PDB file of C-alpha atoms in Angstrom:
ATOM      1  CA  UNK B   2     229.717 113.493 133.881  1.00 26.43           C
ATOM      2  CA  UNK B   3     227.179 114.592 136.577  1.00 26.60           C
ATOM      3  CA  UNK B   4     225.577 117.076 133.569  1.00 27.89           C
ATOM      4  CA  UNK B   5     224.889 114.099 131.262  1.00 29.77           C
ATOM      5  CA  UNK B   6     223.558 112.303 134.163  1.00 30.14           C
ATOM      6  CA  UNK B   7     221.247 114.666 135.437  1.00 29.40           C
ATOM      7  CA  UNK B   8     219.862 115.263 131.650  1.00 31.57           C
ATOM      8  CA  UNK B   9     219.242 111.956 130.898  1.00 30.52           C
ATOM      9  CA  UNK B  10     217.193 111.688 133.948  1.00 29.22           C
ATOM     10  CA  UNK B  11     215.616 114.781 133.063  1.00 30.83           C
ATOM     11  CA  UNK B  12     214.460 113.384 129.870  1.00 30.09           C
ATOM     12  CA  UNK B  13     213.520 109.944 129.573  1.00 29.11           C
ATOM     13  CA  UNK B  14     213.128 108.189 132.741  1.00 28.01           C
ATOM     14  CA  UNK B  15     212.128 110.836 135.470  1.00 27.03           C
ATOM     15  CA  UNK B  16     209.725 112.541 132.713  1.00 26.26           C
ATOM     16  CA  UNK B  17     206.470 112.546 134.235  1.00 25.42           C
ATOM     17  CA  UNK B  18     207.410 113.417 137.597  1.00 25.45           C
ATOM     18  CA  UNK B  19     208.159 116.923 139.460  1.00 23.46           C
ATOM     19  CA  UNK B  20     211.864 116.512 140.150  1.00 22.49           C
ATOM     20  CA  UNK B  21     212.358 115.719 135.645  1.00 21.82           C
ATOM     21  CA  UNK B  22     210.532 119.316 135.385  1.00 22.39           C
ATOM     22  CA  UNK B  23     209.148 118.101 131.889  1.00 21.19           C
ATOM     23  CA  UNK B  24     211.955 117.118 130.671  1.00 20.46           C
ATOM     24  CA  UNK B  25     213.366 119.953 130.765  1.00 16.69           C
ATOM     25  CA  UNK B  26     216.717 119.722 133.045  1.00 18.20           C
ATOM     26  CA  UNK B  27     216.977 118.900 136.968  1.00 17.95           C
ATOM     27  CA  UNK B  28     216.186 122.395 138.860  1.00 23.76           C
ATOM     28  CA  UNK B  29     218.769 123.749 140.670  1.00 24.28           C
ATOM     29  CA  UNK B  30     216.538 123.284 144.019  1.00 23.22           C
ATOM     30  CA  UNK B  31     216.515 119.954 143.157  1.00 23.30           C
ATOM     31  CA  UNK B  32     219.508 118.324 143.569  1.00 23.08           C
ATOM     32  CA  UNK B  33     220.003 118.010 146.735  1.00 24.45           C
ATOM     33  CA  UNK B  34     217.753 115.251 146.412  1.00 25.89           C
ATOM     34  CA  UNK B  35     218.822 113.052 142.981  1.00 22.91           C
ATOM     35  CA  UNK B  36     222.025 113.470 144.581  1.00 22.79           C
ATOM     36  CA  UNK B  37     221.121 111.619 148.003  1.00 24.03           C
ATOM     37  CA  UNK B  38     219.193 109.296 145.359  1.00 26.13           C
ATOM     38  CA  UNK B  39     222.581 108.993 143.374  1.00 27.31           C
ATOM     39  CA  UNK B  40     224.795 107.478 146.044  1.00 27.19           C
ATOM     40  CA  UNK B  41     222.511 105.017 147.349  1.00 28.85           C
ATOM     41  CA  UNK B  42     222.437 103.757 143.956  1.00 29.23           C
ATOM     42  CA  UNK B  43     226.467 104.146 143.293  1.00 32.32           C
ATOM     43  CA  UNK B  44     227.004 102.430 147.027  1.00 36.29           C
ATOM     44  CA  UNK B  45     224.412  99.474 145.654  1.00 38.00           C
ATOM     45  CA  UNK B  46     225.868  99.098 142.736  1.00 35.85           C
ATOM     46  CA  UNK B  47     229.487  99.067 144.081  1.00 36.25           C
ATOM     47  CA  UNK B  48     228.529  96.997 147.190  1.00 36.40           C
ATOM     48  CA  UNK B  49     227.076  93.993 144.820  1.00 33.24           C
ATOM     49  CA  UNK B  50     229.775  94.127 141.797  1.00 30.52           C
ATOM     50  CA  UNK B  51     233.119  94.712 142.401  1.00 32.84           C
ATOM     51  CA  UNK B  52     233.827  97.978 140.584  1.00 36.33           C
ATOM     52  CA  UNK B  53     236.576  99.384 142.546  1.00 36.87           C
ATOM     53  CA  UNK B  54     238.502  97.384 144.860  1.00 37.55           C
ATOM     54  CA  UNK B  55     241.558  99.723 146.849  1.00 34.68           C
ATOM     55  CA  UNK B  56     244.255  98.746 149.610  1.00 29.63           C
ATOM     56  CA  UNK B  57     245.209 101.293 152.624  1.00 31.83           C
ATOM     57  CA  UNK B  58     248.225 100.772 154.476  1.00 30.07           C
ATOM     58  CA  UNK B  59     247.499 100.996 158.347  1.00 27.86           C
ATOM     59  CA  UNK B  60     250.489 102.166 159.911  1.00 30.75           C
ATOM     60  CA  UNK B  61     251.005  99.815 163.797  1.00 31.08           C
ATOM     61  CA  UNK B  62     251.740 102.390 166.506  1.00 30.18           C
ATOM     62  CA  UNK B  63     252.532 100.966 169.952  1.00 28.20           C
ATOM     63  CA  UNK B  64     249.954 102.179 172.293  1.00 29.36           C
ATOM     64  CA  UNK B  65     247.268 101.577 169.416  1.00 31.33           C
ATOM     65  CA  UNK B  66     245.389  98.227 169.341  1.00 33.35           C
ATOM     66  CA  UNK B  67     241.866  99.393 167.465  1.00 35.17           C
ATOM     67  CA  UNK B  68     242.262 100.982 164.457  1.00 37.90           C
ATOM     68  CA  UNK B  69     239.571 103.199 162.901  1.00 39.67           C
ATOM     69  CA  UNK B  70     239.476 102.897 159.267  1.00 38.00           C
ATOM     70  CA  UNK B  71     237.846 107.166 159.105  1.00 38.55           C
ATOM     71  CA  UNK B  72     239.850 109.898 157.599  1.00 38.17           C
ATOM     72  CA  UNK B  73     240.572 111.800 160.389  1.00 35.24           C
ATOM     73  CA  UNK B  74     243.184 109.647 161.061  1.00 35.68           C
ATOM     74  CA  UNK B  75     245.116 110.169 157.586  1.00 34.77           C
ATOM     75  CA  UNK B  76     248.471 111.384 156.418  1.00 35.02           C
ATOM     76  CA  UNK B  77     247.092 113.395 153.593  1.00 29.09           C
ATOM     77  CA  UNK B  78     244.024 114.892 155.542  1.00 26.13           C
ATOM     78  CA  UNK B  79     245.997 117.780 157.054  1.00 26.71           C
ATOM     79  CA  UNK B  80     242.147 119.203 158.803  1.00 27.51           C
ATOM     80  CA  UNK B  81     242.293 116.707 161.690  1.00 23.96           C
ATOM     81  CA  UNK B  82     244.205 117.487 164.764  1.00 25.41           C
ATOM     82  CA  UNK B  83     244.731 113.632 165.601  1.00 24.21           C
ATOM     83  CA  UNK B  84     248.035 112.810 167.167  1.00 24.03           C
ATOM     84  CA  UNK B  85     248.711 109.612 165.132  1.00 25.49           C
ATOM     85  CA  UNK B  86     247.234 109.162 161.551  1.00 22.96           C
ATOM     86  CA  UNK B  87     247.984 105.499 160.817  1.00 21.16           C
ATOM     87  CA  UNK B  88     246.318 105.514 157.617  1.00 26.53           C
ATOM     88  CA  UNK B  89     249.099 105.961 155.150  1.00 28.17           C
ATOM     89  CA  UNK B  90     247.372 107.665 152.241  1.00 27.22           C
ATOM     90  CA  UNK B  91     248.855 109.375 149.046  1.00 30.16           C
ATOM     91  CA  UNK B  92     247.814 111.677 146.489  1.00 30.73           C
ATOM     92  CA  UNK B  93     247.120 108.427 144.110  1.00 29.54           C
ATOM     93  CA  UNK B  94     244.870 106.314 146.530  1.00 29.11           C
ATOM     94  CA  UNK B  95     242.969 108.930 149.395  1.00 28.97           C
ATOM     95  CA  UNK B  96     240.863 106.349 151.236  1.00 28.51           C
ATOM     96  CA  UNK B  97     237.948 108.803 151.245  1.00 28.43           C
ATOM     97  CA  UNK B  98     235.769 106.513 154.037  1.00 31.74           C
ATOM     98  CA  UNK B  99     234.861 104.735 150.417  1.00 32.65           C
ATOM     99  CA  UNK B 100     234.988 101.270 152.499  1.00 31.14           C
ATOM    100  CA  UNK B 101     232.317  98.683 151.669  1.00 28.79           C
ATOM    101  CA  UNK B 102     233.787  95.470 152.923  1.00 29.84           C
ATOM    102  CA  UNK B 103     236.971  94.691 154.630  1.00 28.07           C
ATOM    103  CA  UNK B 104     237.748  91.227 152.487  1.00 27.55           C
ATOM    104  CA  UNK B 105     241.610  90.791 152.920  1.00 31.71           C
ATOM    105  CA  UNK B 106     244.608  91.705 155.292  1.00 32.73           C
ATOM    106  CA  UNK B 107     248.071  91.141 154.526  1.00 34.53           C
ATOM    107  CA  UNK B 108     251.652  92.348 156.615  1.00 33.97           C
ATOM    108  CA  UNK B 109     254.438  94.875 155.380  1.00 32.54           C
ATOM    109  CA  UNK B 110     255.902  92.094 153.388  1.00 31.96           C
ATOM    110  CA  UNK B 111     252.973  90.396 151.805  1.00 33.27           C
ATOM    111  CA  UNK B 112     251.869  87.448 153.363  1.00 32.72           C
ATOM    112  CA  UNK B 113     248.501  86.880 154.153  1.00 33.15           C
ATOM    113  CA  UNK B 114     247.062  87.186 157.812  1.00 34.37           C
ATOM    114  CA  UNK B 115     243.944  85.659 158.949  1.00 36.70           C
ATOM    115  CA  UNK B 116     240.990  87.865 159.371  1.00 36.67           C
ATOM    116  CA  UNK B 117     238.040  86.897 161.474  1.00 35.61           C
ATOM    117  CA  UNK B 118     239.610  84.119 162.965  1.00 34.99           C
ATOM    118  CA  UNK B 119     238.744  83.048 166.154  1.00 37.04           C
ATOM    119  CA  UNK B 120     241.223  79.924 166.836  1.00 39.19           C
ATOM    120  CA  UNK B 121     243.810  81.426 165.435  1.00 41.05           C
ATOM    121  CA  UNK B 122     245.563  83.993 167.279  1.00 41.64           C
ATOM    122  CA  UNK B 123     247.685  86.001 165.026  1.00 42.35           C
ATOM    123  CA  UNK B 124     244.544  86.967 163.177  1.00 39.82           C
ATOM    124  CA  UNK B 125     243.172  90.409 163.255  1.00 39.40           C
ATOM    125  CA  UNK B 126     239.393  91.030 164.263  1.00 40.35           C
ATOM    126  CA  UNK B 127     237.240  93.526 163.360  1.00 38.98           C
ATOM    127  CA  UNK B 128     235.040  94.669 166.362  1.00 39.88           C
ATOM    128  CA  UNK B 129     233.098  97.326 164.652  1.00 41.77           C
ATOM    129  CA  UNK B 130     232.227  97.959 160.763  1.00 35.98           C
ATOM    130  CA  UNK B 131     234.802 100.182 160.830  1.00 35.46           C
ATOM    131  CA  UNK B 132     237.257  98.997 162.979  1.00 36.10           C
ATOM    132  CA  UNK B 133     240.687  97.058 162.724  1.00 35.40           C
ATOM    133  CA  UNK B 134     241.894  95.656 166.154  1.00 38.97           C
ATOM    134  CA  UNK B 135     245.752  94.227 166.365  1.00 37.28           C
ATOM    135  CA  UNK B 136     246.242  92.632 169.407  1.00 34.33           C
ATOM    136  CA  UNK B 137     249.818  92.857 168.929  1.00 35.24           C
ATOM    137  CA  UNK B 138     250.529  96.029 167.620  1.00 37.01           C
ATOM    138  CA  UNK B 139     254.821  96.038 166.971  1.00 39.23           C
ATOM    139  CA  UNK B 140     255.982  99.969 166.374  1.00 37.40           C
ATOM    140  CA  UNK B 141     257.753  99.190 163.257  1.00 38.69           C
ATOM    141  CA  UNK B 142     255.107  97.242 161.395  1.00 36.66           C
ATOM    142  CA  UNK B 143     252.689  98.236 158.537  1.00 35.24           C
ATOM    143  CA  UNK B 144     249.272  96.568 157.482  1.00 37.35           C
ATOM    144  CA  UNK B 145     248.160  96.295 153.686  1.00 39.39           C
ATOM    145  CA  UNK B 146     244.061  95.888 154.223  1.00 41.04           C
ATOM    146  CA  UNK B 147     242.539  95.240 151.189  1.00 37.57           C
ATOM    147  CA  UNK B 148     238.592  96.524 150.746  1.00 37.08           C
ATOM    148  CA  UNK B 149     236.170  96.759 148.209  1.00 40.25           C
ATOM    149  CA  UNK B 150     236.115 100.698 147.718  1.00 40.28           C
ATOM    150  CA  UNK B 151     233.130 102.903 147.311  1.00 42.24           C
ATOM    151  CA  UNK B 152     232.566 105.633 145.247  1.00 41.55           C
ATOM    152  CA  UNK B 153     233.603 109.103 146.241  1.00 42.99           C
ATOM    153  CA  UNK B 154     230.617 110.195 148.107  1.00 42.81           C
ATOM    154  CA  UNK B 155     228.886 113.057 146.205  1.00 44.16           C
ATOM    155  CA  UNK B 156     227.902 116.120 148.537  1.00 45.11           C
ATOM    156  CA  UNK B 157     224.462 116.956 148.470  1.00 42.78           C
ATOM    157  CA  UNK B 158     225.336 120.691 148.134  1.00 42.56           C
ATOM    158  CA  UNK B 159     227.450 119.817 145.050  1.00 43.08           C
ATOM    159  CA  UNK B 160     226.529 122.342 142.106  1.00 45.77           C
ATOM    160  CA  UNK B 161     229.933 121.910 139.589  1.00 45.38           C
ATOM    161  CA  UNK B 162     227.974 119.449 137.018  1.00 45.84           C
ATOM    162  CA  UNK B 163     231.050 118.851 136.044  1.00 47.32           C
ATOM    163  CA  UNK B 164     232.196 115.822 138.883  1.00 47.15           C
ATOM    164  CA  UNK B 165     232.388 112.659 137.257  1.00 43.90           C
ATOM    165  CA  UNK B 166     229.935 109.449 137.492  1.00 46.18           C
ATOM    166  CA  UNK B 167     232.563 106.653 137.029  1.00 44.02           C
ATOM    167  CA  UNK B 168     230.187 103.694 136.280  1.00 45.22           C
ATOM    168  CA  UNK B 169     230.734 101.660 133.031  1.00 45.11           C
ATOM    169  CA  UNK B 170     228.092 102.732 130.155  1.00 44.70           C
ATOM    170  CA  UNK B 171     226.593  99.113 130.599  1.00 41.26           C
ATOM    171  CA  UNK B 172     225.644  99.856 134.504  1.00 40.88           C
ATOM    172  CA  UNK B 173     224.021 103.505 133.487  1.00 44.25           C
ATOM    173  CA  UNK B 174     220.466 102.140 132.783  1.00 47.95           C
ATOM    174  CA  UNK B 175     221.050  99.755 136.507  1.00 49.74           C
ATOM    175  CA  UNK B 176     221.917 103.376 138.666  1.00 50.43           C
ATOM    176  CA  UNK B 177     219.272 105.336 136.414  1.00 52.95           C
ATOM    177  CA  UNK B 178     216.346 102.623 137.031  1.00 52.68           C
ATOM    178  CA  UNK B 179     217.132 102.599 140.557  1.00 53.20           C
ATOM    179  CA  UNK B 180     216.869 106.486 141.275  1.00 57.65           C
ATOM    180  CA  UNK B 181     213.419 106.080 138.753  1.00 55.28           C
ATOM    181  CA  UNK B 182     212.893 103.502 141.799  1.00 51.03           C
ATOM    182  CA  UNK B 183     213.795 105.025 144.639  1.00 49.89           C
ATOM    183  CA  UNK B 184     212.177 108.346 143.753  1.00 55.36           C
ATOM    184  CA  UNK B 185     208.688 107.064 142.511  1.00 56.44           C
ATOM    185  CA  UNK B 186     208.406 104.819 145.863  1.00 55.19           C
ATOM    186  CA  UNK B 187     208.187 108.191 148.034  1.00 52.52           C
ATOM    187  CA  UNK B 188     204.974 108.390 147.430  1.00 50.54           C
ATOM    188  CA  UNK B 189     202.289 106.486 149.179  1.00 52.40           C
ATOM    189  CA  UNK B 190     199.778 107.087 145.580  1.00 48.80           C
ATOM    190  CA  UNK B 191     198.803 103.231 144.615  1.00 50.07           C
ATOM    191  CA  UNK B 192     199.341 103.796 140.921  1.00 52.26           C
ATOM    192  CA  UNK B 193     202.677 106.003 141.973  1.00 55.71           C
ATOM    193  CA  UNK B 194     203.911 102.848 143.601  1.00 58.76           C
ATOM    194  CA  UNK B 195     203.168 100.338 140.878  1.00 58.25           C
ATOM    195  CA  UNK B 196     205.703 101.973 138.897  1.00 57.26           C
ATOM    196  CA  UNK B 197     208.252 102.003 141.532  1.00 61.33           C
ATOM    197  CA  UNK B 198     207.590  98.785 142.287  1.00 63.46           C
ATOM    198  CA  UNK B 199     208.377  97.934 138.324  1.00 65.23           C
ATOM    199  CA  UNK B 200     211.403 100.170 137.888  1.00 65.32           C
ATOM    200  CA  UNK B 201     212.495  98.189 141.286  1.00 64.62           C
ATOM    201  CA  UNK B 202     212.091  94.787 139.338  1.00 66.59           C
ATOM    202  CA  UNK B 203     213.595  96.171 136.333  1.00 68.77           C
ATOM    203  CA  UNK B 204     216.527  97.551 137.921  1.00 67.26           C
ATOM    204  CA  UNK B 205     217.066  93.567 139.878  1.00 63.92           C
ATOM    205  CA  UNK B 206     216.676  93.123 136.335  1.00 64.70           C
ATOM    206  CA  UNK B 207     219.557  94.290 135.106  1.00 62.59           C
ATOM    207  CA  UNK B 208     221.706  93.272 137.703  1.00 61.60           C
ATOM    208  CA  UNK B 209     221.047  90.036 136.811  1.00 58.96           C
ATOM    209  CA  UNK B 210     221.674  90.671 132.931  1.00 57.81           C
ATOM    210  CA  UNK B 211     224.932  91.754 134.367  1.00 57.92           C
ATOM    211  CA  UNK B 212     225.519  88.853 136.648  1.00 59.87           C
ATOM    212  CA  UNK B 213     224.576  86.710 133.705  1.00 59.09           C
ATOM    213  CA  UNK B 214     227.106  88.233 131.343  1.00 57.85           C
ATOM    214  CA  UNK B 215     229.792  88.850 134.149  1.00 57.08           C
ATOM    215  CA  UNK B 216     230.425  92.312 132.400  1.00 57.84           C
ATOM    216  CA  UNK B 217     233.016  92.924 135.035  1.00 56.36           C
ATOM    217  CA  UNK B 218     235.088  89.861 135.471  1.00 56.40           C
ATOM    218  CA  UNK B 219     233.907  88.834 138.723  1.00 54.22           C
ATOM    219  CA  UNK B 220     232.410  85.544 138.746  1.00 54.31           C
ATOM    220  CA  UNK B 221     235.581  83.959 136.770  1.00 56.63           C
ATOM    221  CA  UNK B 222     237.041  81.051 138.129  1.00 56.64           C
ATOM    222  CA  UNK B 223     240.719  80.181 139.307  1.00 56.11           C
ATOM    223  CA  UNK B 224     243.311  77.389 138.635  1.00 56.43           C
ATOM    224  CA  UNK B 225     242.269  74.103 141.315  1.00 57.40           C
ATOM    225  CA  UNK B 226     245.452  74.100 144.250  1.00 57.63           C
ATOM    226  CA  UNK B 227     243.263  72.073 146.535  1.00 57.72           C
ATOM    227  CA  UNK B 228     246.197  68.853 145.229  1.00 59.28           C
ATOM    228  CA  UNK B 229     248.662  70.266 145.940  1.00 59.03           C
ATOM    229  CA  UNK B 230     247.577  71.170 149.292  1.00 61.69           C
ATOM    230  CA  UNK B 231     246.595  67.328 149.960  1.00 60.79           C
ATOM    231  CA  UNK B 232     249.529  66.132 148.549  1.00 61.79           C
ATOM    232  CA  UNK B 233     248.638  64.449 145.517  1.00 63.25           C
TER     233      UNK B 233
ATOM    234  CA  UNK S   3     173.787 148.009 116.080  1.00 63.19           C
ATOM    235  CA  UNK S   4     173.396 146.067 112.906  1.00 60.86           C
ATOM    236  CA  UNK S   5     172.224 142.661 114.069  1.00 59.69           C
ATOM    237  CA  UNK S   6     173.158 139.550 111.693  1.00 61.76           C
ATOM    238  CA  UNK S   7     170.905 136.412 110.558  1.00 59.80           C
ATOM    239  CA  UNK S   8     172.176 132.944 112.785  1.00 56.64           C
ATOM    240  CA  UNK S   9     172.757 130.898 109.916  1.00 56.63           C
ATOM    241  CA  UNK S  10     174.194 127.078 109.834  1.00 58.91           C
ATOM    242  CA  UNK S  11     177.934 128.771 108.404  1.00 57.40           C
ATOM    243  CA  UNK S  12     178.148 130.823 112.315  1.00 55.37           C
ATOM    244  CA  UNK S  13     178.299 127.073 113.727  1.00 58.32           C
ATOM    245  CA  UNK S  14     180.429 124.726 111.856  1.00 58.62           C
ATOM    246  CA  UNK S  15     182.122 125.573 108.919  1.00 55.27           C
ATOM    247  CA  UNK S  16     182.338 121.809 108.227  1.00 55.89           C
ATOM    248  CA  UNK S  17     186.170 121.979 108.343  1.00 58.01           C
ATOM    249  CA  UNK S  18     188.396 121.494 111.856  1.00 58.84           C
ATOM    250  CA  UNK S  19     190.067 124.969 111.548  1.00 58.72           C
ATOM    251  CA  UNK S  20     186.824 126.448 110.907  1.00 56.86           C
ATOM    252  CA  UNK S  21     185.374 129.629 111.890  1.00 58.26           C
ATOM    253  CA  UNK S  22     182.549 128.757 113.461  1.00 56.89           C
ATOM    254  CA  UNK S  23     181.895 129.052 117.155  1.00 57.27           C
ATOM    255  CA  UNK S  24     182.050 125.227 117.753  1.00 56.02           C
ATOM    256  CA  UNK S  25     185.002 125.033 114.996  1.00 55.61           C
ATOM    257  CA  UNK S  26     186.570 127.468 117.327  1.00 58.05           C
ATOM    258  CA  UNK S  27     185.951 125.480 120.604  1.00 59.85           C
ATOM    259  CA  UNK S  28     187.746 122.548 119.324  1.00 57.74           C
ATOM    260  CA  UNK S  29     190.284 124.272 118.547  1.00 59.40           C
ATOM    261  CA  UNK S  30     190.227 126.104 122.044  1.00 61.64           C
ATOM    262  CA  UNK S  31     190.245 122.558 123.803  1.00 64.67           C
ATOM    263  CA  UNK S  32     192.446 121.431 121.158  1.00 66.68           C
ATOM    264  CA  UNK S  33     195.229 123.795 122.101  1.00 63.75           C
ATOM    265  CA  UNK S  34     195.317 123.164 125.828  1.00 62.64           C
ATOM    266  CA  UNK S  35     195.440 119.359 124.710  1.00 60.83           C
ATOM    267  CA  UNK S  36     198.124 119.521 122.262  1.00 64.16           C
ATOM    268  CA  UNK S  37     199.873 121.829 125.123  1.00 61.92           C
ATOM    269  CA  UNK S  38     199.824 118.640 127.369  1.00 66.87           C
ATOM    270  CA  UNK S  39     200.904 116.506 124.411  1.00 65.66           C
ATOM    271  CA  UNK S  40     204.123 118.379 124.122  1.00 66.07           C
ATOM    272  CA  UNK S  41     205.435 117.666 127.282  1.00 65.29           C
ATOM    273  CA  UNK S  42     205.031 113.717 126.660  1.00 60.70           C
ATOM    274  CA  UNK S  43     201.984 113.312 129.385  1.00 60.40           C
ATOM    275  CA  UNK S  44     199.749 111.718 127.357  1.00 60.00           C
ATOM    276  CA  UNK S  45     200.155 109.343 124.432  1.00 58.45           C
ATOM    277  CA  UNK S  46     198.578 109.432 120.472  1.00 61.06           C
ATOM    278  CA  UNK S  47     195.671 107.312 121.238  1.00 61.16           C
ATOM    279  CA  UNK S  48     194.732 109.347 124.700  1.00 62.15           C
ATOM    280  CA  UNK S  49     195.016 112.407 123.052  1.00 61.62           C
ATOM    281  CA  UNK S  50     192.526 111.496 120.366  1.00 65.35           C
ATOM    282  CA  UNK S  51     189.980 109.603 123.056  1.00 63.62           C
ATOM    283  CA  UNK S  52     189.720 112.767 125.270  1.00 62.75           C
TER     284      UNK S  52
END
């Protein structure tokens, strides 16, 4: 939880610093500020390992070609006054703009499509970083883009300490070295930003302890198909 | 006023916690150090070099 977070920072890493006040818990005035420090660290971490990959379906309209991957086009956000929401989002999976990197893009029936491609054309493109364009959008079609997902951005007027942190107990010490980082590098104080500087290489540290280990089953490799393709 | 005799004993009492007056200012400037000390700002072997 936020709480534990926010105390462990207090005491133990952030100690001799104003925003730790002596160990002693995060002010209230305060955290508007490890907050801001918190998702840059959550979007690093989650932008480098793959801790939560999602899929949003992208609904094709006929008159639509670019489609904006934002959340004021959504079926469940009921604030927006857009005509057509294409994104097709349900209670379970949101798609709370917690997009990273557009990796795959399959159809309505779950074959792959092309993404990127330029020879190709049946592939879909993606003009913006946050943009889907179908040159051939069909009326009764559905897409099934795949993205590595983001963690749900924390307001920075968020007071209930009870949100939840969802980062395994191995990346803790990674996201609580990097706010040590990014908030002892504010300062332009020489001996101040020796110790950022440290709990910067500490931190790339640690993310290559993880690497090393592969605590989160990403570097694992897959069964060889390139025979079969040749036709061996 | 009744003066008193400034004898070695109104100095040091030759103990830390003494009652002298220079007994007393150690433990003056003791205080505010152990005062830092408690909020982790300054390790063992600082605390006894300053």
């Amino acid at each position: 939880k936020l709480s534990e977070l926010f105390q462990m920072l207090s005491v133990g890493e952030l100690s001799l610093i104003r925003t730790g006040n002596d160990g002693q818990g995060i002010r209230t005035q305060d955290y508007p500020k490890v907050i801001a420090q918190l998702n840059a660290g959550l979007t690093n971490l989650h932008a480098r390992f793959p801790l939560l990959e999602k899929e949003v379906i992208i609904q094709q309209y006929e008159q639509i070609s670019k489609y904006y991957l934002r959340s004021e086009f959504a079926q469940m956000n009921t604030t927006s006054t857009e005509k057509y929401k294409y994104l097709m989002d349900s209670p379970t999976e949101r798609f709370l703009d917690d997009v990273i990197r557009v990796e795959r893009v399959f159809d309505e029936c779950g074959c792959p499509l092309y993404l990127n491609n330029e020879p190709c054309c049946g592939s879909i493109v993606t003009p913006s970083f946050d943009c889907i364009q179908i040159v051939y959008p069909i009326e009764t079609n559905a897409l099934f883009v795949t993205y590595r997902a983001n963690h749900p951005k924390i307001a920075l007027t968020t007071t209930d300490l009870n949100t939840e942190v969802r980062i395994p107990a191995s990346h803790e010490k990674a996201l609580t070295y990097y706010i040590a980082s990014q908030l002892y590098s504010n300062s332009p104080n020489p001996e101040t930003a020796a110790k950022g500087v440290e709990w910067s290489q500490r931190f790339e540290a640690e993310c290559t302890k993880i690497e090393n280990l592969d605590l989160d089953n990403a570097h694992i490799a897959q069964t060889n198909v390139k025979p079969e393709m040749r036709g061996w | 006023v009744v003066i008193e005799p400034i004898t070695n004993e109104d100095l040091t009492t030759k103990v830390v916690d003494g009652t002298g007056i220079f007994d007393e200012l150690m433990t003056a400037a003791n205080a505010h150090l152990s005062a830092q000390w408690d909020m982790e700002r300054i390790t063992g072997t600082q605390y006894a070099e300053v």
